[PDB]
Ligand binder design. Structure first.
Ligand code: QK3
Ligand code: QK3
Lengths: 305, 301
């Protein structure tokens, strides 16, 4: 029993974290095989950040300008190239701790674990979700750039996020490992604002299923709803639309608990229109949307890595 | 900016997780140097869970009855001894991945990371607090026994908890790494109940300071309170008494934010009386008590 916000074990990623220094800026890099990946803004000064020409800044750099440190060992940079907003530093040594890995771009609503690092050293691991407005509500201080987001499938690490910046509201923006930003963000010191966020409906439903698996049934009701009536109500509360794909993905949880997805949707509709009325679900007074249906099945069935 | 429930990176502990089998029971063990630590109840059968005589059961066991598996390698058990409720299996190989470590017994309100494991394999990492009733609100299924709780100080792992059982309310009980249970629990299936739990007041105050550091000030008020008046109000909401030790520990956060501890105590009294009125504090509609003052300083600065 119990339901916690749980991250993947971070060991496979910790063995890849390195420190990247360029001039006065120090941030984190991901060392996989003979390449260190890091945010390209490591080459910027405070003036350069205002309006940077990264191709122009990078051409002026030499390999010896990038100081890469893996633990207490300095790695030798033998090449450098840029792929979108990520800098790739070719090093003379393949990381012996390189796990089986893939670079995957995730969709909003998908969750992943973040290994927050400072000076190439892992300091914490937390689970979060790619918000529908493409930001992540992370916990990051200055020096955390280059910290990565990942998932684990069997013994394979799928790297899905690299931290680049903090927006004025305290939310975070970053790229996939190919340097493509999530959301309409750019890596420049300029006015940028996160769009109005919405609730990840499929994830709230999955978390309501987790609550039922744990014995919390007070919110269940006798009613069902159509997918269109649920979406009409959901749109009014800034909830993401629920698609037939989401209904299908919730199939196993629906079969395990005996509560049809549209039956759970009618519970969610009442929760939105009436509130919790002083009650809680899994120790929360708010509807939690950072557990996907896969996270719920994985936690409630004990899948290992 | 931002405030998350954050666990320590689990890598140093993952390299210590092994699978321990004794008869038909399989659970997790912690392999440090040449010793595998695990709950002693791994030696129990169906007839031995109500009133086990562990000394009697262990004397009947031989080293070859304990099957220890580290990845796809079977370790050879060369000795066995019991220390309180933990079984120590001496093995013929020192764990090459043994980090710098210590065994530390924690106090209620203290937080730690849990690496939940099944069959010696890590499945997830989450953050916990030792509740004032000495239980932990974990997420554990059958087979998670032997999963450990820890903190990291620089490169040193402090092991503070080993999972032993789930109580009828779904909360969890276990021991330190010396086998001493936290709370009045025993490793028997005899009727056991967690005492009425209370809110870790010092941790709620620390989290209110984290909210102020992050720009959330709506709950602040112009009032202060005496320590005794705060405690008289706090007990009525099943909050733990706040001691002078707790006030002292909150000193650095008080200095950083400019809000005296008793001033923050009056904000907490107001929140308990009014509720949140549709507002949240750090994305939460409830007062969070699983961040210590040390966690807040570490995460924020
Ligand atoms: O690492 C540097 C260098 N640097 C040296 C001292 N100050 C900054 N700069 C990255 C920066 C950013 O936002 N990153 C940070 C990440 N996470 C949390 C943060 C908390 C506090 C302050 C910065 C944070 C600074 C602000 O301007 C921008 C704008 C765009 C981009 Cl892509 C990046 C940044
Ligand atoms: O593995 C054995 C079952 N066994 C058979 C044969 N020999 C032993 N026992 C562990 C047990 C316990 O509580 N563990 C579990 C831990 N975490 C989550 C759980 C979720 C579901 C079910 C069990 C859980 C079972 C219940 O009775 C007790 C009583 C005391 C103790 Cl210390 C241990 C246990």
């Amino acid at each position: 029993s119990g339901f916690r916000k749980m991250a993947f074990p971070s060991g496979k990623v910790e063995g890849c974290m390195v420190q990247v220094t360029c001039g006065t800026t120090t941030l984190n890099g991901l060392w996989l095989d003979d390449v260190v990946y890091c945010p390209r803004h490591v080459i910027c000064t405070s003036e350069d950040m205002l309006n940077p020409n990264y191709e122009d800044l990078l051409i002026r750099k030499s390999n010896h300008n990038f100081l890469v440190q893996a633990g207490n060992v300095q790695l030798r940079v033998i090449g450098h190239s840029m792929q979108n907003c990520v800098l790739k530093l070719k090093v003379d040594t393949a990381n012996p701790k390189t796990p089986k890995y893939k670079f995957v771009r995730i969709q909003p609503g998908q969750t992943f674990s973040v290994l927050a690092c400072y000076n190439g050293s892992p300091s914490g691991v937390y689970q979060c979700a790619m918000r529908p407005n493409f930001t992540i509500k992370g916990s990051f201080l200055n020096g955390s750039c280059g910290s990565v987001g990942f998932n684990i499938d069997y013994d394979c690490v799928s790297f899905c996020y690299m931290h680049h910046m903090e927006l004025p509201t305290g939310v975070h923006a970053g790229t996939d490992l190919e340097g493509n930003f999530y959301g309409p963000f750019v890596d420049r010191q300029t006015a940028q604002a996160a769009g109005t966020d919405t609730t990840i409906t499929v994830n709230v439903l999955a978390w309501l299923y987790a609550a039922v698996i744990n014995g919390d049934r007070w919110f269940l009701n006798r009613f069902t709803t159509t997918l269109n009536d649920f979406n009409l109500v959901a749109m009014k509360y800034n909830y993401e639309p629920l698609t037939q794909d989401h209904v299908d993905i919730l199939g196993p949880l629906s079969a395990q608990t005996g509560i049809a997805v549209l039956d759970m949707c009618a519970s969610l509709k009442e929760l939105l229109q009436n509130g919790m009325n002083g009650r809680t679900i899994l120790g929360s007074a708010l509807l939690e949307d950072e557990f996907t249906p896969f996270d719920v099945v994985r936690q409630c069935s004990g899948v290992t890595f």
